[PDB]
Design an enzyme around this catalytic site. Structure first.
Site, short mmCIF file in Angstrom:
data_model
loop_
_atom_site.label_atom_id
_atom_site.label_comp_id
_atom_site.label_asym_id
_atom_site.label_seq_id
_atom_site.Cartn_x
_atom_site.Cartn_y
_atom_site.Cartn_z
CB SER A 144 -13.02 -31.06 -43.06
OG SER A 144 -12.23 -31.65 -42.09
CE1 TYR A 158 -16.06 -28.76 -39.05
CE2 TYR A 158 -14.80 -30.84 -39.45
CZ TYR A 158 -15.02 -29.26 -39.38
OH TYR A 158 -14.00 -28.69 -40.03
N1 LIG Z 1 -8.00 -27.48 -38.49
C1 LIG Z 1 -8.57 -26.60 -39.03
O1 LIG Z 1 -8.57 -25.17 -38.68
C2 LIG Z 1 -9.89 -26.89 -39.97
C3 LIG Z 1 -10.59 -26.20 -40.38
N2 LIG Z 1 -11.44 -26.47 -41.62
C4 LIG Z 1 -12.52 -25.73 -41.85
O2 LIG Z 1 -11.82 -24.18 -42.19
C5 LIG Z 1 -12.88 -23.29 -42.38
C6 LIG Z 1 -12.27 -22.12 -41.58
O3 LIG Z 1 -12.14 -22.15 -40.31
P1 LIG Z 1 -11.09 -21.88 -39.53
O4 LIG Z 1 -9.97 -20.92 -40.28
O5 LIG Z 1 -10.25 -22.92 -39.19
O6 LIG Z 1 -11.53 -21.30 -38.32
P2 LIG Z 1 -11.61 -19.64 -37.81
O7 LIG Z 1 -12.74 -19.56 -37.01
O8 LIG Z 1 -10.21 -19.35 -37.37
O9 LIG Z 1 -12.04 -18.90 -39.05
C7 LIG Z 1 -13.64 -19.01 -39.25
C8 LIG Z 1 -14.03 -17.58 -39.43
O10 LIG Z 1 -15.39 -17.79 -39.96
C9 LIG Z 1 -16.44 -16.95 -39.36
N3 LIG Z 1 -17.55 -17.84 -39.14
C10 LIG Z 1 -18.01 -18.46 -38.53
N4 LIG Z 1 -19.18 -18.85 -38.48
C11 LIG Z 1 -19.52 -17.78 -39.46
C12 LIG Z 1 -21.13 -17.43 -39.94
N5 LIG Z 1 -22.13 -18.23 -39.50
N6 LIG Z 1 -21.18 -16.70 -40.73
C13 LIG Z 1 -20.07 -15.80 -41.39
N7 LIG Z 1 -18.76 -16.05 -40.83
C14 LIG Z 1 -18.63 -17.02 -39.67
C15 LIG Z 1 -15.68 -16.82 -37.84
O11 LIG Z 1 -16.10 -15.62 -37.18
C16 LIG Z 1 -14.22 -16.96 -38.27
O12 LIG Z 1 -13.67 -15.50 -38.39
C17 LIG Z 1 -14.18 -23.89 -41.59
O13 LIG Z 1 -14.97 -24.40 -42.61
C18 LIG Z 1 -13.59 -24.93 -41.02
O14 LIG Z 1 -14.58 -26.10 -40.78
C19 LIG Z 1 -11.26 -27.76 -41.99
C20 LIG Z 1 -10.48 -28.80 -41.56
C21 LIG Z 1 -9.69 -28.25 -40.53
#
Ligand SMILES: NC(=O)C1=CN([C@@H]2O[C@H](COP(=O)(O)OP(=O)(O)OC[C@H]3O[C@@H](n4cnc5c(N)ncnc54)[C@H](O)[C@@H]3O)[C@@H](O)[C@H]2O)C=CC1
Ligand SMILES: NC(=O)C1=CN([C@@H]2O[C@H](COP(=O)(O)OP(=O)(O)OC[C@H]3O[C@@H](n4cnc5c(N)ncnc54)[C@H](O)[C@@H]3O)[C@@H](O)[C@H]2O)C=CC1
Lengths: 271, 271
Positions: A144, A158
């Protein structure tokens, strides 16, 4: 490395950024394994690909990236069912934020387990086979920009984990290079996703004794802004990084100046 | 803040940097609690201060910073026996380095437990009381320049944890400031110390299944270079950081250019 003919294993592959990466790797000729803790996300992702007659090229595995036994089993299952993987995307993450004084040990353990130990577990479980198969590969870790630009205490758990993921990725590069495995750390700004559902995604064992349930409830109501980036745009940035072996991918430039100021203050502390 | 009459709780306070900090805090009027996993180090520190007719102002506690129960006990014992503390120095650390392909989960867990969870446990166990007492205070976390400048895979576990400590310290600043508690992250270069005894310092539960015993045995024979900095010089930098509430302290400038190059590469990745 060429993406055509590879298998990619994508944690958090069934929503948000991971799903955007999935779509674009598939579009570039990869087959996919999507690993995710949310069965409903997995089901939705599977249906989306089946509607486009791509279901044969996609396999789903329900797991918690912080469970090392499930990760070991998933490496075996990936190889047996889909081959490989050649591309490892340690992308799953959650938002453990909230008032700093309210956070408990359960909240620290949760935040570090998913956002830092998830990628470590992926590396440990998957890279031995990536080396052994001897056909190279690539690892993408989703950190991030919050791991780089200064953040407030409400985001301590985080930011701490995400800064560690950046450094983890930098440090492993030369080891992975021994076996023609490249690495990338992805540092996003605001991307449209379902990370606001993080409270639902918290593994059962970290629920009792959390101090942050109220924050998770509030988060769940947050509106996805229309000006946030689309996950498929990020997916294309990741294709580019894999093809060209790019160490760093940042999705936004809005924190250039704040990062510069941090960097300057760090340099200024040096004699 | 002002140091005279305060009590400072210093993890790893019986050797190396922590002991240098201890000497200079005592010189500036603080009473000390030295917390360390090595009884022989504690005994030597005790004897040192007794020889200087300062024993009444130094209390020792044997503990592992990664044991939360022992840290809660230590917060009670510190307050009861010596008062406070007003100054919290989360300095203990170890060297978990070795050939990356040899490192096991035990090595990751060890390195993260001591070098990242140690400071977190200190914050969690001690800061509630520091806030409650209402006389302000200060926290110093010892990270490393290895958490900032690019490092090779042999140092992955160390670098990853140390980067996290830097970010941790930055993020907690505003919360701690609510109660007039300042924070500092110390980022040393090469300081004369006994960190080469890290193998001896590894807690028992992390020994079985380690892949780095051979590396630790070689490390134990490493000679402390005469041109490394003295711990008391670092101690004086820390006195200044506490008095003037400085967020960052670096002991050496040798990695200015390598950090600049890293920072530029990070900025270059931003659109
Ligand atoms: N603005 C944003 O969306 C930003 C996101 N991120 C990072 O991007 C990455 C993806 O997140 P997003 O696509 O935004 O959210 P999201 O929630 O849409 O996708 C994340 C997916 O990972 C799954 N997940 C969560 N914990 C889990 C676990 N313990 N084991 C297996 N699967 C798990 C969720 O069920 C979900 O389907 C994360 O690492 C997040 O921290 C970083 C900066 C910004
Ligand atoms: N000496 C150097 O060149 C550098 C040292 N550092 C860091 O400085 C800090 C202090 O280390 P040094 O003074 O160099 O080494 P040191 O080994 O002389 O002092 C550290 C002390 O912490 C104790 N300790 C280790 N593990 C512990 C645990 N689990 N619980 C309680 N106490 C524990 C040790 O027994 C020892 O007395 C560490 O965090 C280290 O990572 C950072 C950069 C450079």
């Amino acid at each position: 490395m060429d993406i055509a003919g590879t298998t990619a294993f994508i944690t958090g592959g069934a929503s948000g950024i991971g799903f955007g990466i999935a779509q674009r790797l598939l579009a570039n000729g990869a087959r996919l394994v999507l690993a995710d803790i949310r069965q409903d996300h997995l089901d939705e992702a599977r249906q989306f690909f089946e509607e486009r007659q791509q279901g044969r090229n996609v396999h789903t595995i329900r797991l918690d990236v912080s469970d090392r036994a499930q990760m070991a089993e998933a490496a075996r299952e990936c190889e047996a069912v889909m081959g490989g993987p050649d591309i490892l995307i340690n992308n799953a993450g959650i938002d453990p934020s909230g008032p700093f004084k309210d956070a408990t040990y359960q909240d620290w353990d949760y935040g570090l387990a998913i956002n830092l130990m998830g990628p470590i577990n992926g590396i440990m479980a998957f890279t031995p086979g990536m080396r052994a198969r001897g056909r190279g590969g690539h690892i993408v870790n989703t950190a991030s920009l919050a791991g780089l630009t200064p953040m407030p205490s409400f985001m301590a758990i985080y930011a701490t984990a995400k800064a560690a993921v950046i450094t983890l990725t930098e440090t492993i590069r030369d080891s992975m290079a021994e076996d023609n495995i490249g690495v990338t750390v992805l540092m996003p700004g605001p991307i449209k996703s379902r990370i606001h559902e993080s409270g639902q995604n918290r593994p059962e064992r970290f629920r009792a004794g959390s101090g942050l349930a109220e924050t998770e409830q509030q988060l769940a109501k947050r509106v996805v802004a229309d000006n946030w980036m689309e996950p498929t745009e990020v997916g294309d940035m990741i294709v580019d990084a894999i093809v060209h072996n790019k160490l760093y991918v940042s999705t936004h430039g809005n924190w250039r100046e704040t990062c510069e100021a941090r960097f300057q203050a760090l340099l200024d502390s040096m004699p």
